[PDB]
Amino acid sequence: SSRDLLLKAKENGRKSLLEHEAKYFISSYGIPVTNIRLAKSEEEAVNFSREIGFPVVLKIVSPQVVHKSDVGGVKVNLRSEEEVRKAYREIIENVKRNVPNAEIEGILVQEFAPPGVELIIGLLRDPQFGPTVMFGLGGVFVELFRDVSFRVAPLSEQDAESMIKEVKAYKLLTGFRGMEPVDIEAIKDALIRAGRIGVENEEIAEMDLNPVIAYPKGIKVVDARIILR
């Protein structure tokens, strides 16, 4: 599905897909992503924001910026034209100051996903077992506690379901104080498709979907990184 993005990246000596390319790529595999627009100017950012609908999110797009929040390159819940303009300039200044030698490809405009239960979905290439899908709850649960499950791809439905139920923070998905159970079927479907992406695209070394926001109905990938080899 749109292998052309991977081929173009290789042809141009890039070792990764950027957020908008990564989201387009996994979207073509049936993983729900945010609507997105690459704005080259503050004016395009405003116009794209109206097209997407408020509130929106703006993010830096640059090869030299992998961790966008850490350098002030992410602004969420922008509710008006004026807030979009303010955010636009703030991001550009933050990146020029923190990453002087950064090639600014533009500013990505995307829908604002409302709060839900955050997940991480990963793909890596294991020397022995090949493409392997990773799952965990978002934030501290994977990043600090390292609570992750793995299944070697391709995944069956049995693999996807059991690897979800397996993680220690699983109960965050089945209802707790102030939060309804989220759509486990949509998660399973995303995990299987992540496995297919790895099986079918040998030039993909890693994929990181962090975070994926899960809702009572469906999920939505809010950030995406694909690393090539």
Binding site: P127, Q128, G130, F150, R151, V152, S156, Q158, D159, M163
Partner: protein
């Protein structure tokens, strides 16, 4: 080719490196081959010997007036490639290379050349850096390990040399009947996947146990494809070496490789239906139970015990394995209440009271096994002065015979020297017996764990 029939069942085996000097490894292997009763032809290969162990010796395999299936090679590494070439000329299909001094000591190049040359003649390599192999159905002991094993249906594959050859001996002490011992060492060519394909087809093999350090890059997907289908019919138990981060880091240096992912190996084993053992003792305890019992047909597990203590240890151990006991069927309760006092507990475990005589072990076991709503039985026995351990053991044997069915049973016995004797007696009759209630319960848990592992793979293979 990938057909190992004539590796395990050769008509002719050559031993290259046997000597008039009997202390040499080639000579030890030749001695074992003869001692263990190989019925095919054996060809000692030595540069000068007229004969070795009463058998005509030849200077090279290619001079043998016969088609040699397997050449067991026990010469120094600087002599191996030459022998491979002659074996090639002679058309030998398998080179079993005892010789050390290849990749495990940094000579990757010599090892890769070994395999290239072998493949160039349509010849496969086992090893190198191995202690050989044994196949009981063919009365074939091509190792320099112990001369004998107990015959049975367990195939043991070992990536480790010293631990492998030691465990070969340990099977005898633990009464484990063996169909095969295979030292795979450096795994330069033939590996676990090839061997699993053979033991899958082998009617003599009912259980496969593997001591595994790691598999080769790019080999894991096929490992899962083969292992998962084998697991539908035969349990695979893996002793994983480097199952901890520190063990994997350390073990990485054992042969000088990259540390394999602990977590991903564990998932691969789960997707393969494989049981991972964290110790030798668990591996052997489970192997024994799986070797000698059918898989339970349901979840109606009964524990029979004299006195509550052993029963509680059993309950806790089963729970740690995610096995929970349910109240026994009323039909069984009434049957047992025909001889048990009213102060007995029937909650499951069934407590026939600490001072139960020998006879109640016979009657309780028989009643349980015969009951249609009982799928499996663990019998626990604490030695006191009112019983005899051997009497209890024989009561269990007789009950299993008279029940006439085949339901999984494990036995735990706690006591002094007489209990050690009774447990040995039971194991020699292929009744899985252990000297503590927890080991008896863990062994029964392996039967259920294998049923669950198989169910995982089946669910994974379910047609849409």
């Amino acid at each position: 080719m990938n057909d190992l029939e004539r590796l395990f069942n050769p008509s002719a085996i050559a031993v290259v490196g046997a000597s008039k000097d009997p202390s040499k490894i080639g000579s030890q292997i030749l001695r074992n081959l003869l001692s263990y009763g190989f019925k095919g032809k054996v060809y000692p290969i030595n540069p000068t010997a007229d004969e070795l162990m009463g058998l005509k010796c030849y200077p090279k395999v290619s001079d043998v007036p016969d088609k040699v299936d397997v050449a067991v090679i026990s010469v120094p590494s600087d002599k191996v490639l030459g022998v491979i070439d002659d074996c090639g000329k002679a058309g030998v299909k398998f080179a079993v290379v005892i010789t050390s001094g290849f990749k495990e000591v940094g000579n990757e190049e010599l090892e890769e050349e070994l395999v290239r040359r072998a493949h160039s003649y349509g010849m496969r390599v086992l090893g190198p850096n191995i202690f050989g192999y044994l196949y009981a159905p063919a009365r074939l002991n091509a190792t320099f390990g112990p001369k004998d094993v107990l015959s049975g249906n367990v195939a043991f594959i070992s990536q480790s040399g010293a631990l492998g050859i030691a465990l070969m001996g340990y099977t005898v002490v633990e009464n484990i009947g063996i169909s095969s011992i295979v030292s795979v060492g450096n795994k330069a060519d033939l590996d676990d996947v090839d061997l699993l394909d053979f033991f899958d087809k082998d009617p003599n093999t009912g259980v496969i146990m593997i001591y595994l350090e790691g598999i080769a890059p790019g080999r894991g997907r096929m490992f899962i494809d083969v292992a998962s289908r084998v697991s539908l019919r035969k349990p695979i138990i893996v002793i994983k070496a480097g199952r901890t981060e520190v063990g994997a880091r350390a073990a990485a240096s054992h042969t000088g490789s990259i540390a394999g992912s602990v977590a991903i190996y564990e998932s691969a084993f789960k997707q393969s239906g494989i049981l991972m053992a964290k110790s030798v003792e668990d591996a052997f305890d489970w192997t024994k139970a799986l070797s000698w019992n059918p898989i339970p047909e349901g979840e109606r597990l009964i524990v029979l015990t004299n006195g509550g203590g052993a029963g509680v240890q059993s309950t806790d151990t089963f729970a740690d394995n995610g096995i929970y006991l349910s109240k026994p069927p009323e039909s069984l309760i009434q049957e047992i209440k025909k001889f048990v006092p009213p102060f007995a507990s029937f909650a499951n475990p069934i407590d026939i009271t600490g001072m139960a005589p020998d006879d109640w072990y016979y009657m309780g076991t028989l009643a349980a096994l015969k009951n249609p709503d009982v799928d499996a039985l663990t019998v626990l026995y604490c030695q006191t002065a009112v019983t005899t351990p051997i009497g209890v053991a024989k009561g269990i044997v007789d009950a299993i015979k008279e029940a006439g069915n085949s339901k999984p049973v494990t036995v735990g016995m706690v006591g002094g020297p007489e209990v050690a004797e009774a447990v040995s007696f039971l194991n020699k009759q292929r009744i899985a017996a252990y000297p503590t209630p927890e080991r008896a319960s863990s062994a029964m848990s392996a039967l259920y764990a294998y049923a669950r592992a198989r169910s995982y793979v089946m669910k994974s293979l379910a047609v849409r």
